[PDB]
Amino acid sequence: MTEYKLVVVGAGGVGKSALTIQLIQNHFVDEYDPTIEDSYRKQVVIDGETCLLDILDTAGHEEAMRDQYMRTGEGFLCVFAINNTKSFEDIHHYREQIKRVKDSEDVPMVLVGNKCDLPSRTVDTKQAQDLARSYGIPFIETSAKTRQGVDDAFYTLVREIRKHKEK
Numbered sequence: 001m002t003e004y005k006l007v008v009v010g011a012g013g014v015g016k017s018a019l020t021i022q023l024i025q026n027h028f029v030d031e032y033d034p035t036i037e038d039s040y041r042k043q044v045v046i047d048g049e050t051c052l053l054d055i056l057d058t059a060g061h062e063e064a065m066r067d068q069y070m071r072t073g074e075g076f077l078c079v080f081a082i083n084n085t086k087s088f089e090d091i092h093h094y095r096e097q098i099k100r101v102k103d104s105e106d107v108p109m110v111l112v113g114n115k116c117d118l119p120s121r122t123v124d125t126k127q128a129q130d131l132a133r134s135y136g137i138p139f140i141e142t143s144a145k146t147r148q149g150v151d152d153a154f155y156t157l158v159r160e161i162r163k164h165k166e167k
């Protein structure tokens with residue numbers, strides 16, 4: 001009944017598509033096929049209401065045309081990989097142009113640190129928690145491989161959109 005337009009953004013290879021495919025199909029895509037742009041719809045129950053989720057899976061390095069889908073989107077899943085410091089530093093550039101394009105400091109957003117199943121972490125959990133708090137947004141650790149945190153990342157974004165509409 002309620003439609004939510006979600007956009008997954010982040011650097012190349014951080015796991016945007018794998019996180020999206022886990023939510024929708026409950027399988028882990030281990031092969032890496034770089035995305036140009038895919039979108040998916042899923043009906044799911046979150047906190048007792050049926051939600052229609054429109055999920056836009058974006059490309060890491062874009063060709064910019066971010067603005068068109070950044071204006072249509074209501075919530076943004078900002079994804080970095082915990083073994084890629086650069087992808088974590090890229091987060092503030094993603095948030096800056098979302099804020100610019102939507103012309104607001106209060107945009108529904110969730111910070112996602114993906115690939116937490118790997119033993120080669122270079123971005124600490126506390127680092128991300130502090131960046132999240134400085135933005136005033138949730139932070140969720142995930143692994144598309146084991147599916148840990150996957151529903152929570154998307155559902156938490158739904159709830160950030162739900163709060164923004166009910167301010």
Ligand SMILES: Nc1nc2c(ncn2[C@@H]2O[C@H](COP(=O)(O)OP(=O)(O)OP(=O)(O)O)[C@@H](O)[C@H]2O)c(=O)[nH]1
Pocket residue numbers: 010011012013014015016017018019029030031032033034035036058059060061114115116117118142143144145146
């Ligand atoms: N170990 C591990 N590998 C992961 C995880 N998530 C993604 N991968 C792998 O990392 C690679 C990149 O994953 P994608 O989901 O395709 O990357 P992306 O962010 O969609 O990348 P672009 O579409 O190119 O922007 C693939 O080989 C995935 O199988 C994870 O949680 N753990």
Ligand SMILES: [Mg+2]
Pocket residue numbers: 016017018033034035057058059
């Ligand atoms: Mg992809």
